[PDB]
């Protein structure tokens, strides 16, 4: 392959053949817009009348398409189609012990009734992440699991676990103007570690007010004593958020009715919505944040027993 240039009435498109080319072009033009599947950009251009006069397509780059099995998880290049992620994870779940695939199973649950085969065959993993919709079904799972993101520019390279700080504001991520997401490592589950993901069965607004979540608990070895707890939600704000104030309070507590009560009390407060919050369905969304946690609570008890 070689780099290609296409020129339109309004837009210049560069098809990058190598990672070095992509990073050079992004340094030369930090405002250049990346496009892989165009399943978000096409909507932005048509329906939100966005215009990006320079587009770079990195779909051909080997590094952005690589699937790699490591000691700590499965790494997907950022241009990998969701269909490919789904296939790889289904295979992993089929062959590996249940205790190692709790996070994988969560991703698969979020992908289950998620667009047709048509969308999933071209929608990239990195595209969903960087799009940063408040109602992404994937970012809550990546946040709750501490999924590691490898981020690169001309002369920089850094790997960060996704946490609450990665989404500072509406549709924004903690990336530099020049940076591109290279790869995403979805971790194996450890001993005494459990995971669930849930999502609202309705959507009424373009990118707000659909509850979706990832929930992780790590216990002290062989115990019901909480060592780590993460509950991350989409559709409750203008970005993916973590109920940190609530979860911090449960550390060293035991997995019982008192914890159920306290977490539910915390969620009702921390995630409270004003009567006029964008998207409405105020009562329903609060009820779901609690009902989803209840399901997680019961599921973790069944896994513990």
């Amino acid at each position: 392959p070689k780099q290609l240039r296409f020129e339109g009435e309004r837009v210049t498109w560069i098809q990058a053949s190598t990672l070095k080319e992509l990073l050079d072009l992004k340094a030369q033009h930090p405002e250049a817009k990346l496009v892989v599947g165009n399943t978000e950009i096409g909507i932005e251009m048509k329906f939100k009348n966005q215009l990006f006069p320079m587009i770079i397509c990195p779909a051909w780059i080997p590094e952005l398409n690589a699937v790699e099995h490591g000691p700590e998880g499965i790494s997907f290049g950022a241009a990998c189609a969701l269909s490919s992620v789904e296939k790889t994870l289904l295979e992993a779940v089929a062959k590996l012990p249940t205790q190692k695939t709790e996070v994988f199973r969560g991703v698969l649950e979020q992908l289950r009734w998620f667009a047709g085969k048509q969308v999933k065959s071209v929608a990239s993993l990195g595209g969903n992440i960087i799009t940063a919709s408040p109602i992404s079904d994937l970012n809550p799972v990546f946040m709750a699991s501490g999924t590691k993101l490898t981020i690169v520019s001309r002369g920089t390279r850094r790997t960060v676990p996704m946490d609450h700080t990665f989404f500072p504001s509406y549709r924004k991520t903690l990336l530099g103007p020049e940076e591109i997401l290279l790869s995403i490592e979805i971790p194996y589950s450890r001993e005494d570690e459990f995971f669930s993901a849930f999502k609202q069965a309705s959507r009424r607004e373009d990118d707000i007010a659909k509850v979706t979540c990832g929930m992780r608990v790590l216990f002290q070895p062989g115990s019901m004593q909480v060592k780590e707890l993460a509950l991350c939600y989409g559709g409750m704000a203008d970005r993916t958020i973590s109920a940190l104030k609530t979860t911090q309070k449960q550390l060293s507590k035991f997995w019982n009715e008192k914890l159920l009560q306290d977490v539910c009390a915390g969620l009702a407060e921390e995630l409270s919505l004003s009567p006029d919050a964008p998207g409405g369905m105020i009562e329903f969304r609060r009820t779901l944040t609690l009902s989803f946690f209840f399901k997680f609570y019961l599921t973790v008890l069944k896994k513990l027993g």
Binding site: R204, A268, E283, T287, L288
Partner: protein, 755 residues
């Protein structure tokens, strides 16, 4: 003779191969241009300026059209209360203000987006409540009354009163609105290809806007990718705009709407609010009913009045009510004008009926099926509008559905399930329906045909009806073949056109098969009458021989046919005269399982028994039953339109407006056509099928309501006779909020609560 055989839709193979031509599939002329509507972003405001300076910079821009460009009249709409292009004021978001014309649809789109409009807001009215508070109505109250309401209510053991709301519905035909207009350049002549159920009004409205005689305008309709009532009138919004562009430029012009435009501009089903009061005995027998209906009509009259008339005609469903008063008011609001949608006011009124009937059963503590059966009409009874029920087959449909669905056994299994599960519940309901067949406006119940037999014996049939997927042309070919006693292979229908059959009614009201079948039949009779001498002289010859002999003897092989439905004409000022020719009937039983923690649900099983008389084509009729039922399931359970407080539609495409999907349909889905029930009143003993089955989708809604009642018994309180309000659509939000428990109340947090 293929009448009664399951012949596939005649265009099915071409549809599967992508060879069937829809309006936008027609080749473009070398010089053909594209139109994009420019539309209001405010519910109610004065237009202060329109700036096209930025639009003129777009490559390929031709012109901007507005009110000032119209040569004839800017007054349009069924009741002449609309503008083609808004002039001084806009009265809904989506109100058409002008149009851009350009050399490509991409260029038209680009240009339209940068047209800048400046507004001065005016007080807007959006909700039914807004409208009632402001006395904002079209026309006066509609009413049907029978018996003595005072007295009826005196004799009642129990009285229940309440309020209920049913949301509207977007048509979501897979093919949006589309028109091509070809100006000829002679004498005002124009030929249009349109996705419309109403070529006649298209022709008239175009002629009126241009200020030319109707005979100058030719409208052609090959087929639509769905109509569902949404192309009965609203298609003229696009057609008239494109016609103007064609006139102004002298070029052919076309426009196909994007989904988001279509959902915003073209109108949907009418939302309804009902306030009701029912009086009944401890046995569940109904003695008095009062219902005040209000529809959200939007910003013009359109078909709103007739829709409310049909609602009032169906407030009884299948139940005899001796003392009854129904009224209706059309709310005038700053929303896109609502219009015809499969069922045409019927589903709303029927939903309201089944809601209070459900509450009667609960209040009496009796099984719902028992209460429905007890209150059912009998053969020969008069409706509340005093029409006799002749051939009343609901009891047969009911008995057969109960048996084949194994209702009573499955009811026990539902009870067992609910006994054993805390956070999931099942529900099961069986619901009847009757639907009156005919336009409620007498003069629309007329139909024309034109038939030619060519000298090779091949036959070309033309009739007033349009094909929108319902298989009308298929059925007309089956009818012609039977009537003429020749194979279907000798007959062809090409399209619907205003120069073959003039003055046609819209293809609507489920009667097209009935009325065009009669028109086609009569034309066929005339042909047979003319060929009879030649058949006599050559009884062993072929059709071809007879046709050639007739031709050589200078006998005409071309004729019209015409039909007008007899004995129709209901008077609101006497409460007498036939509103309908006959009624179509059916029964549905559905079972659901709800997730009490999430509000999601599974459609487990549906059984339907439908009285369609002697089907002309059971494959097509079963297809209409299934399709209609699923559209009803959408109306009652999935499909929710949502507006900002400013009156702007939020739900403008499939990502935010959920029509039934492959995975939405009942896991076990059974449909039977009732046997041995010929209908003397229609062509070859058949019955209209298009709209009647839609309301049966409500069986899913009432199963869901049953499941919710179980959840409330589990976690909410101990009152088994409790009435709770459940509006339509019963979305996950409404279902979840109704399962009051330690989560909805926050009792799980340690707080005191109402569970």
């Amino acid at each position: 003779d293929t009448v009664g055989r399951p012949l596939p839709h005649l265009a099915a193979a071409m549809q599967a191969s992508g060879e069937a031509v829809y309006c936008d599939d027609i080749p473009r002329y070398e010089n053909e241009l594209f139109l994009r509507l420019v539309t209001s972003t405010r519910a109610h405001a004065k237009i202060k300026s329109i700036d096209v300076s930025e639009a003129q910079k777009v490559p390929g821009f031709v012109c901007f059209l507005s009110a000032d460009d119209i040569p004839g009249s800017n007054e349009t709409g069924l009741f002449n209360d609309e503008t083609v292009f808004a002039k001084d004021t806009v009265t809904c978001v989506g109100h058409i203000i002008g149009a851009v014309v350009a050399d490509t649809p991409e260029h038209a789109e680009r240009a339209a987006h940068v047209v800048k409009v400046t507004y001065e807001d005016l007080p807007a009215i959006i909700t039914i409540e807004d409208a009632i508070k402001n006395n904002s109505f079209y026309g006066s109250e509609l009413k049907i009354e029978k018996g003595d309401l005072k007295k009826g209510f005196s004799e009642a053991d129990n009285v229940v009163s309440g309020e209920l709301y049913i949301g509207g519905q977007d048509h979501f035909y897979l093919e949006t609105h589309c028109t091509i207009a070809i100006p000829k350049g002679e004498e005002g002549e124009m030929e249009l290809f349109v996705s419309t159920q109403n070529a006649m009004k298209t022709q008239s409205f175009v002629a009126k806007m241009l200020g030319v005689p109707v005979n100058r305008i030719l409208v052609r309709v090959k087929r639509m990718g769905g109509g569902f009532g949404g192309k009965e009138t609203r298609s003229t919004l696009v057609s008239v705009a494109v016609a103007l562009a064609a006139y102004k430029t002298g070029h052919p012009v076309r426009c196909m709407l994007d989904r988001n435009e279509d959902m915003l501009i073209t109108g949907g089903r009418h939302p309804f609010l009902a306030r009701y009061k029912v009086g009944f005995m401890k046995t569940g027998t109904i003695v008095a009913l009062e219902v005040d209906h209000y529809s959200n009509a939007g910003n013009s009259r359109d078909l709103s009045h007739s829709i409310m008339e049909r609602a009032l005609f169906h407030m009884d469903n299948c139940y005899k009510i001796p003392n009854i008063r129904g009224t209706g008011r059309l709310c005038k609001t700053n929303l896109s004008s609502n219009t015809a949608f499969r069922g045409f006011g019927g589903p709303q009124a029927l939903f309201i009926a089944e809601n209070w009937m459900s509450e009667v059963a609960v209040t009496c503590g009796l099984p719902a099926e028992e209460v429905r059966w007890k209150n059912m009409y009998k053969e020969g009874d008069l409706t509340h509008f005093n029409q006799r029920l002749e051939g009343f087959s609901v009891p047969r449909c009911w008995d057969e559905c109960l048996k084949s669905s194994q209702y009573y056994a499955r009811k026990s299994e539902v009870d067992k399930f609910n006994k054993e599960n805390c956070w999931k519940k099942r529900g099961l309901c069986i619901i009847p329906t009757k639907f009156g067949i005919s336009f409620t406006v007498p003069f629309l119940n007329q139909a024309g045909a034109l038939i030619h037999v060519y000298t090779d014996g091949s036959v070309l049939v033309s009739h007033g009806g349009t094909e929108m997927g319902q298989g009308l042309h298929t059925k007309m070919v089956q009818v012609a073949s039977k009537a003429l006693k020749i194979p279907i292979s000798k007959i062809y229908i090409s399209e619907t056109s205003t120069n073959t059959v003039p003055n046609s009614s819209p293809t609507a009201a489920s009667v097209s098969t009935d009325i065009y079948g009669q028109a086609v039949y009569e034309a066929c009779q005339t042909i047979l009458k003319r060929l009879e001498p030649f058949k006599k002289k050559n009884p062993d010859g072929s059709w071809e021989d007879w046709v050639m002999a007739a031709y050589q003897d200078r006998v005409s092989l071309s004729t019209t046919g015409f039909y007008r439905t007899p004995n129709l004409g209901y008077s609101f000022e006497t409460n007498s005269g036939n509103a309908f020719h006959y009624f179509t009937y059916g029964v549905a039983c559905s079972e659901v399982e709800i997730d009490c923690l999430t509000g999601d649900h599974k459609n487990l099983r549906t059984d339907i028994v439908m009285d369609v008389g002697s089907s002309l084509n059971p494959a097509i009729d079963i297809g209409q039953v299934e399709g209609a039922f699923v559209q009803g399931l959408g109306l009652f359970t999935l499909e929710e339109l949502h507006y900002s407080p400013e009156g702007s539609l939020h739900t403008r495409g499939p990502s935010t407006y959920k029509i039934p999907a492959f995975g939405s349909i009942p896991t076990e889905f059974r449909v039977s056509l009732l046997r041995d029930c010929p209908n003397k009143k229609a062509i070859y003993a058949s019955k209209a099928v298009g709209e009647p089955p839609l309301f049966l989708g409500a069986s899913v809604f009432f199963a869901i309501k049953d499941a919710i009642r179980a959840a409330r018994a589990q976690h909410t309180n101990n009152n088994t006779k409790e009435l709770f309000r459940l509006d339509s659509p019963a979305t996950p939000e409404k279902i979840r909020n109704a399962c009051v428990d330690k989560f909805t109340t926050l009792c799980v947090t340690g707080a005191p609560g109402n569970c």
